[PDB]
């Protein structure tokens, strides 16, 4: 079981520069090439870095040139990307890549799960929670508010992850304001709904902050 | 250096056949991935070599082609493989990955599950009300949603959010959110939203009187 674990970015400002790590385990990592590729929110792939085993051979993109430094500390079995001079524009989801096999002409087999990098001058906002409590509107509804935050993103799990048949939670969306709102609602049985305990667990990562909201009807 | 996928979006039934191009601008000969990306999770190698096949992928995932043009085929679509799929070059830099191409599950039609929610007192005493409408489990994923608090159709003040098509069942959840501040939420009584879909007969309003 190969895993790959990035970290480190969450907010920066533009024109400054962020390191982001990716520790990997579950295979050999002094025999593979490895790579950065980055998804804009919204938007497609994008192939960022590349580098060989042995850190000696080395490409950037050109949306990357002069800006980025891909590295890797075999000892440590890590693998670093320094992104100098960010832009606006660099806000992505940043994934590392093992490559098929011992050598550089060759597919991405495992990925990471990407950490996500936001590129603004604002300001990290943790969000208030709000209960959606069911009332009249067989099955009956209830959920959770995430509203006013920054940056993205959050995660919200039910019952401390117990809880997931029926669960959504949608797609943050940013406000006039500037900071994201999100809700998670739940279908559930009416009948246990006097004797059911539900709760939502929000978590936003870049404020520290984490809440555990209890929804009563 | 270039790659063109096509086309961008497709929306095909379950049991189709489907098949997505990809078109190399040199000549990358037998040295193409294809990668298979589901909602809000990481990517996947399906295809290598442009036609060989990562172990335990179904056999219906089969890509072909060689050199400059490429093609990926799904020769029984089966509900899960709504995902975006990407081609990725790898005979030598930039590992250029192509447009993409969304895939989206085409099922009968299936009218939604409505529910509203007045703000929570919690809110109020932050100044700002917002009511939320769920649209619950539909498709097709175009539905028309309509305000009206004191019958007067609001305007401008509403964002929806909507789900990925779901792997199982392949239908959309929609949540559109009015927001107004504790003042305008005081003045009105009767808030509504009010629901036009194509699995309708006609249209919904589910809606509560305070405020």
């Known amino acids: 079981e190969v895993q790959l674990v990035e970290s480190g970015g969450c907010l920066v400002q533009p024109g400054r520069s962020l390191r982001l790590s990716c520790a990997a385990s579950?295979?050999?990592?002094?025999?593979?090439?490895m790579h950065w590729v980055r998804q804009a929110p919204g938007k497609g792939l994008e192939w960022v870095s590349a580098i060989t085993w042995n850190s000696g051979h080395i490409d950037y993109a050109d949306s990357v040139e002069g800006r980025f430094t891909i590295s890797r500390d075999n000892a440590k079995n890590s693998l670093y990307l320094q992104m100098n001079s960010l832009r606006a524009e660099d806000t992505a989801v940043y994934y590392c890549?093992?490559?098929?096999?011992?050598?550089?002409?060759?597919?991405?087999?495992?990925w990471g799960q990407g950490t996500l990098v936001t590129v603004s001058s604002a300001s990290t906002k943790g969000p208030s929670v709000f209960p959606l409590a069911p009332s009249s509107k067989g099955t009956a509804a209830l959920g959770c508010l995430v509203k006013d935050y920054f940056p993205e993103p959050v995660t919200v799990s039910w019952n401390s992850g117990a809880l997931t048949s029926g669960v959504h939670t949608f797609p943050a969306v940013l406000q006039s304001s500037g900071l994201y709102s999100l809700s998670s609602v739940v279908t559930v049985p009416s009948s246990s709904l006097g004797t059911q305990t539900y709760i939502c667990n929000v978590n936003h990562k870049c404020s520290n902050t984490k809440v555990d909201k209890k929804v009563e009807p | 250096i270039q790659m063109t996928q096509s086309p961008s979006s497709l929306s095909a039934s379950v049991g189709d056949r489907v098949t997505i191009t990809c078109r190399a601008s040199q000549g990358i000969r037998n040295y193409l991935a294809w990668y298979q990306q589901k909602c809000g999770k990481a990517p996947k190698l399906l295809i290598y070599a442009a036609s060989t096949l990562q172990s335990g992928v179904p056999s219906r995932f089969s890509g072909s082609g060689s050199g400059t043009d490429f093609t990926l085929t799904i020769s029984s679509l089966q509900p899960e493989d709504v995902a975006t799929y990407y081609c990725?070059?790898?005979?030598?830099?930039?590992?250029?990955f192509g447009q993409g191409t969304k895939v989206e599950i085409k099922r009968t039609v299936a009218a939604p599950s409505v529910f509203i929610f007045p703000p929570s007192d919690e809110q109020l005493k932050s100044g700002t009300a917002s009511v939320v409408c769920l649209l619950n489990n539909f498709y097709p994923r175009e539905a028309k949603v309509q305000w009206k608090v004191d019958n007067a159709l609001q305007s401008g003040n509403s964002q929806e959010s909507v789900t990925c098509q779901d792997s199982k069942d392949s239908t959309y959840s929609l949540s559109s959110t009015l927001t107004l501040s504790k003042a305008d939420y005081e003045k009105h009584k009767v808030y509504a939203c009010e629901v036009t879909h194509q699995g309708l007969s006609s249209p919904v309003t589910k809606s509560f009187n305070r405020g």
């Open positions: 579950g295979f050999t990592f002094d025999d593979y090439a």
């Open positions: 990725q070059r790898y005979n030598r830099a930039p590992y250029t």
């Open positions: 890549a093992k490559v098929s096999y011992l050598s550089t002409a060759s597919s991405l087999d495992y």
